[PDB]
Amino acid sequence: MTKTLPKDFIFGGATAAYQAEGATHTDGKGPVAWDKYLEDNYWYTAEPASDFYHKYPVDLELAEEYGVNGIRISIAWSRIFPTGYGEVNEKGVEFYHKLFAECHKRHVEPFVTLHHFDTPEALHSNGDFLNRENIEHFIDYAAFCFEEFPEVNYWTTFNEIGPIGDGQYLVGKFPPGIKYDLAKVFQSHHNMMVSHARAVKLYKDKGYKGEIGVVHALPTKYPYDPENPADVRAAELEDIIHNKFILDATYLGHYSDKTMEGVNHILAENGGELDLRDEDFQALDAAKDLNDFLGINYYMSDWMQAFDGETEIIHNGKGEKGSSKYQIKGVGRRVAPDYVPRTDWDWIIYPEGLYDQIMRVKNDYPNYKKIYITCNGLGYKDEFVDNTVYDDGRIDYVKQHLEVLSDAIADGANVKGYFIWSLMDVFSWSNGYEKRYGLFYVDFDTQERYPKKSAHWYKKLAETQVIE
Numbered sequence: 001m002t003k004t005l006p007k008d009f010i011f012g013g014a015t016a017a018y019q020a021e022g023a024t025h026t027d028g029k030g031p032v033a034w035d036k037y038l039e040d041n042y043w044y045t046a047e048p049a050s051d052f053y054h055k056y057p058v059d060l061e062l063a064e065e066y067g068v069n070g071i072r073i074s075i076a077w078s079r080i081f082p083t084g085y086g087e088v089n090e091k092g093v094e095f096y097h098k099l100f101a102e103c104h105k106r107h108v109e110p111f112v113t114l115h116h117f118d119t120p121e122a123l124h125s126n127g128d129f130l131n132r133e134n135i136e137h138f139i140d141y142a143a144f145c146f147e148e149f150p151e152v153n154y155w156t157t158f159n160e161i162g163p164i165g166d167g168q169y170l171v172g173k174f175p176p177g178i179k180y181d182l183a184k185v186f187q188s189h190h191n192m193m194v195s196h197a198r199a200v201k202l203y204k205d206k207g208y209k210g211e212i213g214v215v216h217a218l219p220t221k222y223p224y225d226p227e228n229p230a231d232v233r234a235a236e237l238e239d240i241i242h243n244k245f246i247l248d249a250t251y252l253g254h255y256s257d258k259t260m261e262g263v264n265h266i267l268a269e270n271g272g273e274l275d276l277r278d279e280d281f282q283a284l285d286a287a288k289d290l291n292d293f294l295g296i297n298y299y300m301s302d303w304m305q306a307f308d309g310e311t312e313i314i315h316n317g318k319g320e321k322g323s324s325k326y327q328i329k330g331v332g333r334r335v336a337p338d339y340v341p342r343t344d345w346d347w348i349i350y351p352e353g354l355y356d357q358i359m360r361v362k363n364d365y366p367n368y369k370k371i372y373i374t375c376n377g378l379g380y381k382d383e384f385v386d387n388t389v390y391d392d393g394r395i396d397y398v399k400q401h402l403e404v405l406s407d408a409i410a411d412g413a414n415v416k417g418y419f420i421w422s423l424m425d426v427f428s429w430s431n432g433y434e435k436r437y438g439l440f441y442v443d444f445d446t447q448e449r450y451p452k453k454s455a456h457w458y459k460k461l462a463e464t465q466v467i468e
């Protein structure tokens with residue numbers, strides 16, 4: 001009497017080059033911003049990470065043992081072009097071909113992302129994507145990869161553009177560690193999206209065989225008190241900063257009137273200017289209907305309350321329940337509802353928000369075509385016991401969301417797969433190695449993998465499609 005998922009659903013796992021790989025200075029790998037940054041601003045580094053560079057056969061064998069039929073992986077732009085452009089690093093390219101081969105061998109379909117929070121340092125320190133020159137460097141890097149890896153049937157350009165501008169120019173937790181720059185945020189959202197529109201046009205023109213799409217973070221924004229118009233407006237603007245702006249570029253080819261009115265407002269109150277060239281809209285309009293699927297990364301929702309004070313944002317990275325604080329002048333502040341389960345990192349559990357996002361994209365952008373939940377998971381300090389982890393909380397979190405998908409599917413939403421963040425334990429960019437999300441437990445001192453209770457649960461799900 002439980003829900004069921006379509007027989008052709010993808011039950012995958014997700015990873016990220018920098019988070020998983022390791023080998024940060026091996027086989028010609030070029031530096032990335034995180035190299036110096038984590039060292040100066042955090043208490044851990046990307047070494048040894050989960051040593052994916054050498055472990056992948058074990059990871060893939062296990063992934064196969066436990067019914068995982070898909071896997072998001074990212075190509076480390078700085079491993080192919082250790083400087084963003086020019087010389088190619090043979091060994092880098094060699095590595096990916098191996099990896100890709102192992103995937104096909106293990107029946108795990110690779111969903112490849114060209115960019116996942118890791119612009120080659122040399123280019124990043126030069127304005128990253130705010131600098132229009134790097135847009136070029138990207139398209140060339142994409143064309144290289146498209147041509148070089150015919151083994152890949154599914155491509156994605158960028159992973160979470162919103163969260164890049166957010167952690168980079170708004171929260172200041174991702175390098176360069178800038179804060180409150182709502183002008184840079186919106187610019188980066190526009191520039192990066194132009195970089196995407198171009199690469200997709202390109203993959204389509206040169207008529208390659210597979211599918212090309214985007215991976216967007218879409219945390220549902222709700223007004224704290226639906227009855228208060230002040231709250232409604234607040235969620236609306238908040239949603240515009242994190243979701244609408246980007247979505248619109250991804251489908252309308254331009255920013256809607258409400259979107260620009262809100263952006264105008266936000267920028268007026270906080271200052272700032274946007275450099276929007278007409279050629280950018282030619283690129284955007286061209287690729288608007290090209291995307292083959294949408295990848296929705298979703299972890300939690302946000303409630304917004306009106307707020308008239310100055311802007312202050314504190315990121316709770318050590319996992320101290322309550323240290324999070326988010327308020328923006330002209331926009332509003334986030335207030336967790338009273339009794340929703342939230343965690344030590346303050347991330348709110350609210351499965352219903354996923355359903356609402358899926359019905360929103362579906363209604364506002366009917367041309368989405370197909371939806372994959374490219375990332376969903378619960379990060380928390382598991383306890384290593386009996387060579388496993390009795391991660392019942394994670395099974396509950398996942399199970400709850402999978403049920404909401406099973407519904408959004410029934411209600412006419414074209415959802416084709418779910419990717420659990422993450423396949424194995426990896427360190428978090430701003431929360432260290434403590435915030436674990438994996439189906440498999442990595443013992444960072446030995447690099448030994450151990451299936452968690454969720455790995456065993458996911459298997460039955462995989463081979464039954466009955467959520468129980």
Ligand SMILES: O=P(O)(O)OC[C@H]1O[C@@H](O)[C@H](O)[C@@H](O)[C@H]1O
Nearest residue numbers: 016160297375379428429431435
């Ligand atoms: O902030 P956390 O704990 O790392 O969880 C956030 C996760 O979200 C995903 O969407 C990002 O692409 C991952 O790289 C990961 O960072």
